[PDB]
Amino acid sequence: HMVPMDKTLKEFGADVQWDDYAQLFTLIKDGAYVKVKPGAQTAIVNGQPLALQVPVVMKDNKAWVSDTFINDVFQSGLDQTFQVEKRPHPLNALTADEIKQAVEIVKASADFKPNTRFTEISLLPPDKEAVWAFALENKPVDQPRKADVIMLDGKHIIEAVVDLQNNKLLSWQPIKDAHGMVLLDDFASVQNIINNSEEFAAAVKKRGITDAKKVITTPLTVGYFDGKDGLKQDARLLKVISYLDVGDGNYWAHPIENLVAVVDLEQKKIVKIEEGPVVPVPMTARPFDGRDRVAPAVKPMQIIEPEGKNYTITGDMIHWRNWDFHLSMNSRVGPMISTVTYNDNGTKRKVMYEGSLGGMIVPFGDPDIGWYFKAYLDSGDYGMGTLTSPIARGKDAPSNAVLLNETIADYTGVPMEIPRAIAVFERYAGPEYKHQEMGQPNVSTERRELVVRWISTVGNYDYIFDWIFHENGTIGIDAGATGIEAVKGVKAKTMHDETAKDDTRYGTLIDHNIVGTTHQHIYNFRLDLDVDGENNSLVAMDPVVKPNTAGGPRTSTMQVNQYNIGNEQDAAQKFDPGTIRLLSNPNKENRMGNPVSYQIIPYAGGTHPVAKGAQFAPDEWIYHRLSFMDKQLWVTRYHPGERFPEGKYPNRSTHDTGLGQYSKDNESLDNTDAVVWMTTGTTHVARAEEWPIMPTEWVHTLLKPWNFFDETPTLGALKKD
């Protein structure tokens, strides 16, 4: 017996194209590009013939395939994109079995508590030196696989370490005063609590809302105000902002302004309700899913690689041209790019040991009750890896992408597979280089970039991160922001209304009675670059205009002020895009005797106004707790336990436990293992073009080899000598 081809292929996730003239089907799915003609005894997979016992059957215009067709074709072996890893990479994320094992161990602990949740369950970082030895020398890591198990018992944090190899608990340590991030059940809890609140229902009624069942809540961390917000620093709290569900699939467009409820998660009740002036809920329908729009006609455009990809995916190891790297997933920061090497004519040179999003923050600048405390620490407080948004094939990534699935642990300790978690794709990126000498044959080569894309959605905003590997050694890091804007309900319909001026003091009026409150998007990337070795130094090269002292008509010259940045404190700074900042290896030089290096560019451009630092006065608490938001470049000594710019437990934190803390002892950065942290952000002043849904806005960062190589890296293999 057989099954309908289209339906089955679609279910499976493959693109199906029928060519009536050629009587040919073209099926695409990740690295598999297949061609099959009805009735043929063979199909083509990535240019190779594949025998089929049962041919594709065409009936009354309906195609049918056998029940084994998907597996026979798509798992044939002719698609070489993915290869089986023989020797497990030490950095492979915990498998589902390991996750379950780690949970069983802690639950077997005499101290374990029954309502305990898991904020994070991740592989405990094997020693960096052994990992590199494995990647470069293939030496086995003899230290046991261990996992960090961070638990939330009520409101108390407990860090546990388990030895998976020996199936035993190594440590169990309660972390005093730390608050746990927001967990999935916290969201349902807040909605329920609000739903059972008599007072809230009453507060809501006297604001126009009739059916309180139509109120949609969103949970926000409260931050820290040394008590000015009147909140017990000891309790596990969350503030709640509400919207009215009008049935347009966009509750974000119907704010119930000036109503904030504070919920105590352990007490499971509203401990405080802050009420302000009553502002009529913006009611007009403002769907963003196209239900009310005409579907435009567009001609097909496809990016195809008929013979397969140029990259190979062995286990989680990616090999592409001269690059080699390990790609894993973390529930808090998302994707982790490790042991990145560049194959320089046979010799694999180290570039980056570990790279990933450090952390990010989206702080608002409106002082009103529903906004003064708004500051989202997306990864830290909400867990971006966990909130990964599966890639919409052909839309969120090009049609020639390969989408990977990633596994992490949910808050209850149960393995969770995120489908299409990360997209991998090669893309044409203009001419790599070109030279059309007058009267001579032209010289041009195409540039190819390997992109690693991951999307995470937290409430109303969607963030896209691209790790771009250029064939020439450069590495790009871009962040895109899109989603639905956080708006403030206001009385003005237009800028001509009486309250307009006051309503727009902290944001643009982007719709009737709707203001897009100004805020910033501040991303921070933690890049443990190991420029051709562990021991590096930070060097500054500031292009300057110097008085000409060589004679001739010129009064000035362009020279450079080169100097080393010897410590963390001095390395923590603002980035002038007019200057050059290098992470060099003072122990290795290129053919011209120049130290092998990488130029760090925390600011390579963006489509929204650039954030020059935090848009907060120096006396603000958010400013105090989070110092990473005010400097674009930071450089610290390597420490396996320092991975977040905002600190490990940022929820309700009273002091900088992040980059402020990591650079506090102002250690030496001379010829030692350095870790670069790039902070880049935008200052978002809204406009109507961004409502009801915002067009993706991007920011770019770059890491370029500087004298790391001896010549143009993409010239090709030397034909002589």
Question: Considering only residues 662-681, where is the footprint of Ca ion by CB under 5 A?
Answer: 667, 673-674
CB of 190 to its own copies, least distance (A): 13
CB of 208 to its own copies, least distance (A): 22
Residue 608: how many CB atoms within 10 A of its CB?
Answer: 18
From the list Ca ion, Cu ion, its own copies, none, which binds 617 (C-beta under 5 to 8 Å, kind-based)? its own copies
Interaction of residue 433 with its own copies, rule CB under 8 A: yes
d(CA 477, CA 605): 11
CB of 64 to its own copies, least distance (A): 20
CB of 318 to its own copies, least distance (A): 16
DSSP 19-35: ETTTTEEEEEETTEEEE
Within residues 518-577, the interface with Ca ion by CB under 5 A covers 528, 530
163, 378, 466, 630: the active-site residue: 378
From the list Ca ion, its own copies, Cu ion, none, which binds 685 (C-beta under 5 to 8 Å, kind-based)? its own copies
CB of 396 to its own copies, least distance (A): 5
Instruction: Give the H or E element holding residue 63.
Output: strand 63-66
Q: Which residue has the tokens 């916290």?
A: 186
Interaction of residue 349 with Cu ion, rule CB under 5 A: no
**Among residues 155, 493, 588, 637, the one that binds its own copies under rule CB under 8 A:** 493
Interaction of residue 274 with Ca ion, rule CB under 5 A: no
568 is known to lie in a ligand binding site: yes
For Ca ion, the closer CB: 622 or 676: 676
**Among residues 407, 535, 569, 714, the one that binds its own copies under rule CB under 8 A:** 714
**Among residues 179, 648, 684, 704, the one that binds Cu ion under rule CB under 5 A:** 684
Closest CA to 523 of 669, 428, 409, 646: 646
**Among residues 145, 146, 448, 521, the one that binds its own copies under rule CB under 8 A:** 448
251, 353, 461, 649: the active-site residue: 461
Span near Cu ion by CB under 5 A; candidates 259-267, 332-340, 492-500, 682-690:
682-690
Closest CA to 627 of 594, 664, 592, 600: 664
223 is known to lie in a ligand binding site: no
d(CA 418, CA 14): 18
What is the x/- site pattern for Ca ion, positions 475-514, by CB under 5 A? Answer: ----------------------------------------
DSSP 543-601: EEEEE--S-SS-SEEEEEEEEEE-BHHHHSB---TTSEEEEEEEEEE-TTSPEEEEEEE
**Among residues 510, 583, 674, 675, the one that binds its own copies under rule CB under 8 A:** 510
Span near its own copies by CB under 8 A; candidates 113-121, 125-133, 191-199, 584-592:
584-592
Burial class (CB in 10 A: 0-12, 13-18, 19+), 32: buried
CB of 479 to its own copies, least distance (A): 12
From the list Ca ion, its own copies, Cu ion, none, which binds 528 (C-beta under 5 to 8 Å, kind-based)? Ca ion
396 is known to lie in a ligand binding site: no
Q: Which residue is nearest to Cu ion (CB)?
A: 684
Interaction of residue 457 with its own copies, rule CB under 8 A: yes
524 is known to lie in a ligand binding site: no
Span near Cu ion by CB under 5 A; candidates 102-110, 228-236, 419-427, 677-685:
677-685
Residue 533: which residues within 8 A CB-CB, separation 6 or more?
Answer: 350, 585, 587, 588
389: amino acid identity, one letter: S
The structure tokens listed for 595 are: 């130290």
**Among residues 331, 338, 339, 389, the one that binds its own copies under rule CB under 8 A:** 389
CA 40-44-45 angle, to 5 degrees, is: 145
Interaction of residue 687 with its own copies, rule CB under 8 A: yes
530 is known to lie in a ligand binding site: yes
Beta strands in 89-145 (DSSP E): 117-123
d(CA 45, CA 27): 9
Interaction of residue 652 with Cu ion, rule CB under 5 A: no
Interaction of residue 6 with its own copies, rule CB under 8 A: no
**Is position 153 annotated as part of the catalytic site?**
no
From the list Ca ion, its own copies, Cu ion, none, which binds 637 (C-beta under 5 to 8 Å, kind-based)? Ca ion
Interaction of residue 431 with its own copies, rule CB under 8 A: yes
Interaction of residue 488 with Cu ion, rule CB under 5 A: no
- Contact status, residue 575 vs residue 676, Cβ threshold 8 Å: no
**Is position 411 annotated as part of the catalytic site?**
no
Contacts 24+ apart (CB under 8 A), 158-161: 158/116, 160/106, 160/109, 161/124
Asked if the peptide bond before residue 645 counts as cis, ω within 30 degrees of 0, the response is no
Within residues 628-667, the interface with Ca ion by CB under 5 A covers 636-637, 667
In 3-state terms, what secondary structure has residue 163? strand
251 is known to lie in a ligand binding site: no
DSSP at 688: G
**Among residues 570, 589, 667, 670, the one that binds its own copies under rule CB under 8 A:** 589
Residue 140 CA to its chain's centroid (Å): 31
Burial class (CB in 10 A: 0-12, 13-18, 19+), 490: buried
From the list Ca ion, its own copies, Cu ion, none, which binds 372 (C-beta under 5 to 8 Å, kind-based)? its own copies
DSSP 207-268: TT---GGGEEEEEE-----TTTT---TTS-EEEEEEEE--SSS-GGGSEEEEEEEEEETTTT
From the list Ca ion, Cu ion, its own copies, none, which binds 673 (C-beta under 5 to 8 Å, kind-based)? Ca ion
Within residues 287-306, the interface with its own copies by CB under 8 A covers 288-290, 292-296, 298-306
d(CA 577, CA 574): 10
For Cu ion, the closer CB: 518 or 701: 518
Q: What is the 3-state secondary structure (H, E, C) of 369-414?
A: CCCCCCEECHHHHHCCCCCECCCCCCCCCCCCCEEEEEEEECCCCC
d(CA 500, CA 515): 10
From the list Cu ion, its own copies, Ca ion, none, which binds 530 (C-beta under 5 to 8 Å, kind-based)? Ca ion
End-to-end CA distance of the chain: 63
Interaction of residue 462 with its own copies, rule CB under 8 A: yes
The structure tokens listed for 422 are: 């990360």
478 is known to lie in a ligand binding site: no
Query: 173 vs 149, 169, 295, 565, CA distance in Å?
Result: 10, 11, 57, 38
Q: Which residues are annotated as a binding site for Mn(2+)?
A: 528, 530, 673
Catalytic (active-site) positions: 378, 461
Q: Where on the chain is the footprint of Cu ion (CB under 5 A)? A: 684
Q: Where on the chain is the footprint of Ca ion (CB under 5 A)? A: 528, 530, 636-637, 667, 673-674
